[PDB]
Amino acid sequence: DVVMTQSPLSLPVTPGEPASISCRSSQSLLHSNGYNYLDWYLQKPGQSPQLLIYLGSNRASGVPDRFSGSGSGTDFTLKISRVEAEDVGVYYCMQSLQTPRLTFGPGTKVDIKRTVAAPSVFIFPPSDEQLKSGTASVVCLLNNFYPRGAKVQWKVQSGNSQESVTEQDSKDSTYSLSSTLTLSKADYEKHKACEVTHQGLSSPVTKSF
Amino acid sequence: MVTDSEKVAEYLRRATLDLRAARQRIRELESDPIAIVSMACRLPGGVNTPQRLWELLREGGETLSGFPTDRGWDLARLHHPDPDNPGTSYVDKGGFLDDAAGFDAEFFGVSPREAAAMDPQQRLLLETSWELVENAGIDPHSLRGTATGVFLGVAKFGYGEDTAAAEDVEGYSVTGVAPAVASGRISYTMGLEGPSISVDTACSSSLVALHLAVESLRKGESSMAVVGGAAVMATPGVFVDFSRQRALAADGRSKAFGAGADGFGFSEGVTLVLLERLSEARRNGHEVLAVVRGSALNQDGASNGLSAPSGPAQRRVIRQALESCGLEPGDVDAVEAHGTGTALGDPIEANALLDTYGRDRDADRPLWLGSVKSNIGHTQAAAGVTGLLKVVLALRNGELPATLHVEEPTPHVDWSSGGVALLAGNQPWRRGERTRRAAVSAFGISGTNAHVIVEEAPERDGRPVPLVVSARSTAALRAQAAQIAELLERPDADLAGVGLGLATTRARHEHRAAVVASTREEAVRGLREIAAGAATADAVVEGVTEVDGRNVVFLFPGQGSQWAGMGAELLSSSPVFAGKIRACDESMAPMQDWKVSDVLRQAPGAPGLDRVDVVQPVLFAVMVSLAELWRSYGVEPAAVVGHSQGEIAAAHVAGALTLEDAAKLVVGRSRLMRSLSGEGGMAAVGEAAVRERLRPWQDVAAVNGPRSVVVSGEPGALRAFSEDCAAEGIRVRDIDVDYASHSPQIERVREELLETTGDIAPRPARVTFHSTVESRSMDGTELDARYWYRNLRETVRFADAVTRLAESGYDAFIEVSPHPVVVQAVEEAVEEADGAEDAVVVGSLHRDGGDLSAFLRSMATAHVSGVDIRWDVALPGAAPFALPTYPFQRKRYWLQP
Amino acid sequence: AGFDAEFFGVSPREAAAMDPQQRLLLETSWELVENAGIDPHSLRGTATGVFLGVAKFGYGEDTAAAEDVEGYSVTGVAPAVASGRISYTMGLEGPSISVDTACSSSLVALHLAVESLRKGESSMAVVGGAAVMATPGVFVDFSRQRAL
Amino acid sequence: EVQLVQSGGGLVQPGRSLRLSCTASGFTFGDYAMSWVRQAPGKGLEWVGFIRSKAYGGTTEYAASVKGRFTISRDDSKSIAYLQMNSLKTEDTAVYYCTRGGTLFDYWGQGTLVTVSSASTKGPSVFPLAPSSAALGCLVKDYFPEPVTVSWNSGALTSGVHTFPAVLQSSGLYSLSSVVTVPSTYICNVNHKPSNTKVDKKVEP
Ligand SMILES: [K+]
Ligand code: NA
Ligand code: NA
């Protein structure tokens, strides 16, 4: 009987132009007093969350009046009349019918619209200075793609890779990713590549030693 | 879980808080109270401050005089008693400024030819606007780049119109007389960036300017506003023009609301106020003399003649002014009237008051009515803000001055209603339960009326004091000292408050002097020296500087500086210094038994300054502690340089050594020099020459200059070598030392030194560290134990480090030591170098003079040559005292026909 | 120099003493309200404000001093009266202000009028500026600077 | 104006305790419920607990993951809300936000990072990521604690550079990698203040 909300996973936006974020709840949020118990929050990168809209359509003092909310029952929209570049971040719609809210959920990741771009993939092998130590780090780089969501697989595997992603570049508006496969010098000599996927690619892409 | 009521409480709270913030925003935009933070003026009879105006008004003085004789007017031809005679005036009396032609052109960066071409209205607005900001307790330089607005009432009076056309490549003639430039030139010269507007609605002009400024402030367009008006009659044209109409009072007196009222009496005036949102004044800590609550402007409309007043329009503007701030007429204690002394206009004004304030008025509290024009005449574009000045002065002194010439009130007004009473005499007007309010009216001949509501402002040792004065010429510097001398000869005088006011509320100009004093009497003696152009006393320093900042080098010398009890005073008088000493003793703890603090105090059973192994760690502690004292006054080194073990202080100050590691290095090195006791010597002295002379021996420690050098070695050779230099020429001053540093004698201790100290972990330096060992800027991480041995071992290339830094643009060299041992060598090296030719070199303390006063004197010496000092740190808890304004050095500029 | 004095209730001697800036502001301000489709008489008693950029250009300064019982010479050339006379003759009762910030004067007047309207102080506003070079002084003054 | 000033976090070992504070100014603290919300590095926002105002009983509620280890209290005289954290665990590592309100979170503190780790301070190891046939970089491996900075050519090369967020390895030590693109004279400068470690390394085949 737990009350959840869902919003789109991502939403590219264009400054100067409007944007809309939809929200659907598992249950009507309309209360007998006439209000929908749905609030909108925003977390900008490296900042703390901030309130935007409360009870569906009320804009808190100090929030820019380009933000508004509407909807009723189970369907809600946050509207930005004209997006600004400073509006990127994670938007959350949060029901208040049922408390406490244990999580804010995944929210809607808003970033700068641009043309799709495929990852320029690179593989680097472990250095010799490192092999002298006793461990082997092999890196696979996916540079300047869009949108996020580039996946990587290794075939020397599972449970021995770690990945990291940049924030959207201030210039070209793309992302980059680094994966790092880690095995001991032992398990490394005992063999003699990384498979990428991404929507901007025609088909998967591999790069081997 | 939260109930529905608990959630509703939070949502409804947010909605009512949103509403509250919106309503507050409305009330700010509509009726935010406006602080009058200061005032300034030039009025007739030498009334050149607001206090002088108050003095005049409290006595009932009238400043009327004869026409000026030093303006080129043709007084013989100008007077003629018949009103119908063209080109003449039947009056020969008015209100005229003392010195309308006088101007300090150079202060304002104006050339002599521009000054002469400038309307005196423009020139006196520059002086008064400077004074205005000084009187607010604001360093005028701090308004550069701010959104300060300028709103002035000003009109042309014919300055220069009868001067022969001349050459004018720079266009001085155009900008010199344009009313637009009267406001724009204030903005230009003070670097203001808010709107700057000149307005002309005749007599109401300066209150219209005030009305527009209040709007600009409430909207947030201006952060502060310079408001007022200027009228200087360069030509007699207004006496002639108004004579043809028989509009002038024959005796020149403005007999406002008296039965004798028979026309205008015209005067000159330049009057200004400084305005800010009250809430902003409170936030920023500005004084608040009074508050503007509200104001209204309207028009007479279709009156009985273009220039005839309209009773009904005055009634309306009064009611609109009161309604704009939510007040009732009964809330107002007094009116400063337009009050011109004309037979037609006085009754209409009085009747409009009788019909608004006077209707249903408390029988025991009639509205008090007067007019400053009865004292000083009609100051035209400055009239409205001049009446505002009187109101503010009356509020501040608790008294309503008398209005003159009403021994018989005019019978053309039926005063019987009793709601309005003339101020036939002074009336107490003291702060109390009833909030004191008054209104100011101005009604122009173009028909635009103003009424403004004004309210009282809301209810609100023996240590050394550094007194800093500056000005833009030597004569102005002497005057500024003499003014402060007079201020401090008073009993009212707060020495520390004066110092803090001098340091924080006055622009720091090019010619600078300072006195460090502990009593008023000492302060006056030093300021009187400055006032005479002398600086013979030790507590007095003078200099001149073209910049306001420097690129500072801290210099840390080696031995030679110490003296018994050095810095002992500073342990009591300076927490910053003692805190650093104490920090030094905590880090020197697990390496020695004695404490540096005990040595400086000369405690019992404490070591003395003969053992290298106590001197060096003491001097280290003193130096790094003086460094922290300089830094608490806001002086941060851009680079550091040390001489021998002074490099260790340097490296700590730079951030490259923790204090624990620097203590290790100094204690480590200093014991190990104790071992070599009696086994070495050193003495003082060109480098290449001295090296030729040293070939016969195999016993050069430092190159301090081209004739100053230090040789080190074995005691024997030391004396043998001196005999030669003795029986040949230049001197060989020994050195109080048991050892021989920077010579091969050092090698035996290499091994132990490095192992003892090899534990240190140098860090990156936050401040450039220019090594005197390797003659270059070095990363702090390179300053490991091997480096510190190479400093003990190799030659100190001091002069080259200085030279390098001078040539790289460092122009302030501060010797951080208890006695100046390298100042001379720095000075010589800086002079020979291709570096700045106005560098400053100063020390910190002196053998005699290690108390806070001597340290403040050293900072003063740095300051008068352009090093910025945070003088308020010396004056905690003081409150800034009101000061005189800048002593303008005036010459006459007047274009004659 | 052309003016319909009688239309505006101005005597021949007042007209000659009036700055042409003032005279043409009366005609244009009448036209202005007619062009709005408004009977100008209906603005009598209203809170119409007047906000004008205007400066003196020396009209009358080189004419021999004469008799002037009515003071026409003073009001005729004062920039304050250039705005006030519009209010006087059309019976307007809002603020009437003349401002001088040189070349920006008429947009500063506009900025102040917008403020007056948003505050509700003026119900409508007559806004603009007037420049009539009665004398050649500005060509002479700016010639010395090679600014022309 | 409303302010929520947070303090009291930092590095702590597993099993130990920390007390976070949120000092409020510019509103009537005593009228509001106050909540704590946390965000593990690179993850979502998780509700920790909250305390009611005195007007509603002054009581608390807690997420099941912290119940019995964390407690919230308030001091209405000083206008402070506290989060007392006992028996801390590595997965408690997070930025902790204090916020005004129990249901409507209308004003948020700036956040306090709490890192729970048994790791010792350790300078990084740098290793090159060299080409063969337009992209190279450095791998900065095995350091603690954060942060480590990376420039290229002492801050002369910025174009094409991407310095990646650090990742926390199963060992408890961090590792990041910096990269840059150029075709066909290339050093990365790595700085780790907490261990006073600086390193430059040339990248070539
Ligand atoms: K009139
Ligand atoms: Na002296
Ligand atoms: Na020099």
Domains in chain A, ordered, with CATH?
A: 1-113 (2.60.40.10), 114-209 (2.60.40.10)
* Mutant choice from B1, B3, B14, B24 vs A, greatest count of A C-beta within 10 A: B14
Sign of the dihedral through C-alpha B803, B808, B813, B817: negative
Kindly calculate the radius of gyration of chain A based on its CA atoms and give it in whole angstroms: 22
Q: Are C6 and C14 in contact (CB under 8 A)?
A: no
How many whole angstroms from B6 Cα to the centroid of ligand 2? 74
Give me the residue label for tokens 């808890």: B877
Q: In terms of DSSP bridges, do strands B891-892 and C48-54 run parallel, antiparallel, or are they unpaired?
A: unpaired
Q: Which chains touch A (3 or more CB pairs under 8 A)?
A: B, D
Reported in sequence order, the residue ranges of chain D that DSSP labels E, i.e. its strands, are: 3-7, 10-12, 18-25, 34-39, 45-51, 60-62, 70-75, 80-85, 94-100, 107-108, 112-116, 125-129, 135-143, 149-152, 162-163, 167-168, 174-181, 187-192, 197-202
Judged by CB atoms closer than 8 Å, whether chains meet at B2 and D103 is answered as yes
Edge-to-edge strand list for the sheet holding B681-684: B681-684, B709-713, B702-703
Amino acid at B225: A
Q: Which pair of tokens denotes residue B841? A: 């070199």
Helix B120-135 × helix B179-190 angle, to 10°: 40
User: For the stretch A95-119, what's the b/e string if a residue is b when 16 or more beta carbons lie within 10 angstroms of its beta carbon?
Assistant: bbbbbbbebbbebbbbbbbeeebbb
D33 near B CB under 8 A:
yes
Kind plus residue range of the DSSP H or E element containing A122 = strand A120-124
Q: Rounded CA gap, B794 and B791, in Å? A: 6
Write down how long chain B is: 897
For B437, phi and psi rounded to 5 degrees? -135, 150
Q: Are D139 and A139 in contact (CB under 8 A)?
A: yes
Q: Is C33 a catalytic residue?
A: no
Nearest of B567, B558, B630, B563 to residue B822 by alpha carbon: B558
Alpha helices in B220-359 (DSSP H): 237-243, 278-284, 311-324, 345-356
Q: Which pair of tokens denotes residue B620? A: 């280290």
- Residues contacting B301, CB < 8 A, separation 6+: B310, B313, B447, C44, C45, C87, C88, C91, C92, C93
Q: Are D162 and D182 in contact (CB under 8 A)?
A: no
Q: Rounded CA gap, A17 and D185, in Å? A: 44
How many whole angstroms from B358 Cα to the centroid of ligand 1? 24
Burial class from Cβ neighbours inside 10 Å (0-12, 13-18, 19+) for residue B387 reads buried
Q: Which pair of tokens denotes residue B305? A: 């003649």
Q: Rounded CA gap, B101 and B86, in Å? A: 28
Which chain A positions have a beta carbon within 8 Å of D65's beta carbon? none
Alpha helices in B451-574 (DSSP H): 474-488, 495-504, 520-531, 568-573
The alpha carbon torsion through B122, B128, B134, B140 (nearest 10 deg) reads -10
* Helix, strand or coil, per DSSP, at residue A58: strand
How far is residue B187 CA from its own chain's centroid?
Answer: 18
**Closest in C45, C64, C102 to B180, CB measured:** C102
Judged by CB atoms closer than 8 Å, whether chains meet at C68 and B444 is answered as no
Q: Are B136 and C36 in contact (CB under 8 A)?
A: no
Which chain D positions have a beta carbon within 8 Å of B2's beta carbon? 102-103
Sign of the dihedral through C-alpha B63, B66, B71, B73: positive
Q: Rounded CA gap, B114 and A33, in Å? A: 75
Sign of the dihedral through C-alpha B547, B552, B553, B557: positive
**Cβ-based neighbour number of residue D194 at 10 Å:** 15
Structural domains of chain D, with CATH: 1-118 (no CATH), 119-205 (2.60.40.10)
Q: CA of C142 to nearest chain B CA: how many angstroms apart?
A: 7
Give me the residue label for tokens 């003969």: B610
Burial class from Cβ neighbours inside 10 Å (0-12, 13-18, 19+) for residue A143 reads buried
Q: What is the distance between the terminal CA atoms of chain A, rounded to a whole angstrom? A: 53
For B254, phi and psi rounded to 5 degrees? -95, 100
Q: In terms of DSSP bridges, do strands B768-771 and B639-642 run parallel, antiparallel, or are they unpaired?
A: parallel
Q: CA of C39 to nearest chain B CA: how many angstroms apart?
A: 17
- Residues contacting B239, CB < 8 A, separation 6+: B67, B78, B89, B91, B94, B233, B248, B266
Q: Are B294 and B453 in contact (CB under 8 A)?
A: yes
Distances, alpha carbon C115 to alpha carbons B29, D57, D88, in Å: 11, 51, 61
* Helix, strand or coil, per DSSP, at residue B246: coil
Q: Rounded CA gap, B436 and B273, in Å? A: 20
Q: What is the distance between the terminal CA atoms of chain B, rounded to a whole angstrom? A: 91
Nearest of B192, B201, B198 to residue B225 by alpha carbon: B192
Resolution of the coordinates, Å: 2.1
Q: Rounded CA gap, D84 and A102, in Å? A: 19
List CB-based neighbours of ion ligand 2 within 5 Å.
B 535, 540
Secondary structure percentages of chain D, helix, strand, coil, to 5? 5, 50, 45
Sign of the dihedral through C-alpha B622, B623, B627, B630: positive
Q: Which pair of tokens denotes residue B407? A: 């021994």
Nearest of C94, A9, C110, D136 to residue B316 by alpha carbon: C94
For B27, phi and psi rounded to 5 degrees? -65, -30
* Helix, strand or coil, per DSSP, at residue B149: strand
Q: Which of B41, B183, B203, B561 is catalytic?
A: B203
* Helix, strand or coil, per DSSP, at residue B65: strand
Distances, alpha carbon A204 to alpha carbons A159, A195, A197, A200, B7, in Å: 21, 7, 5, 10, 51
Q: Is B643 a catalytic residue?
A: no
Q: CA of A58 to nearest chain B CA: how many angstroms apart?
A: 8
Q: Rounded CA gap, A184 and A190, in Å? A: 10
Burial class from Cβ neighbours inside 10 Å (0-12, 13-18, 19+) for residue A75 reads middle
Judged by CB atoms closer than 8 Å, whether chains meet at A133 and D61 is answered as no
* Helix, strand or coil, per DSSP, at residue B723: helix
Q: Are B31 and B325 in contact (CB under 8 A)?
A: yes
- Residues contacting A173, CB < 8 A, separation 6+: A111, A112, A113, A114, A146
Amino acid at B445: I
Q: Write down the experimental method used for this entry.
A: X-ray
Q: Are D148 and D124 in contact (CB under 8 A)?
A: yes
Q: Are D9 and D113 in contact (CB under 8 A)?
A: yes
Judged by CB atoms closer than 8 Å, whether chains meet at D99 and A60 is answered as no
Nearest of B291, B160, B305, B180 to residue B234 by alpha carbon: B160
- Kindly state the DSSP code that residue B804 receives in the 8-state scheme: H
Q: Which pair of tokens denotes residue A92? A: 């959350």
Amino acid at A36: N
Q: Rounded CA gap, A169 and A119, in Å? A: 14
Nearest of B176, B422, B174, B142 to residue B284 by alpha carbon: B142
Q: Rounded CA gap, B510 and B107, in Å? A: 11
Judged by CB atoms closer than 8 Å, whether chains meet at A101 and D162 is answered as no
**Closest in B184, B215, B447 to C115, CB measured:** B215
Nearest of B796, B794, B795, B766 to residue B781 by alpha carbon: B766
Q: In terms of DSSP bridges, do strands A19-25 and A50-54 run parallel, antiparallel, or are they unpaired?
A: unpaired
Angle (CA) B247 B251 B253, round 5° = 80
- Residues contacting B850, CB < 8 A, separation 6+: B563, B565, B566, B567, B568, B569, B570, B818
Distances, alpha carbon B827 to alpha carbons B561, B649, B809, B840, in Å: 18, 22, 15, 8
Amino acid at B603: A
Nearest of D173, D115, D113 to residue D148 by alpha carbon: D173
Burial class from Cβ neighbours inside 10 Å (0-12, 13-18, 19+) for residue A48 reads buried
* Mutant choice from D50, D164, D167 vs A, greatest count of A C-beta within 10 A: D164
Give me the residue label for tokens 């509320």: B505
Angle (CA) A148 A154 A160, round 5° = 95
* Helix, strand or coil, per DSSP, at residue D51: strand
Nearest of B158, B176, B132 to residue B184 by alpha carbon: B176
Chain A positions touching chain B (beta carbons under 8 Å): 31, 33, 35, 37, 54-55, 58, 60-62, 96, 98-100
Q: Is B31 a catalytic residue?
A: no
Amino acid at B749: V
Q: Which pair of tokens denotes residue D150? A: 């990376």
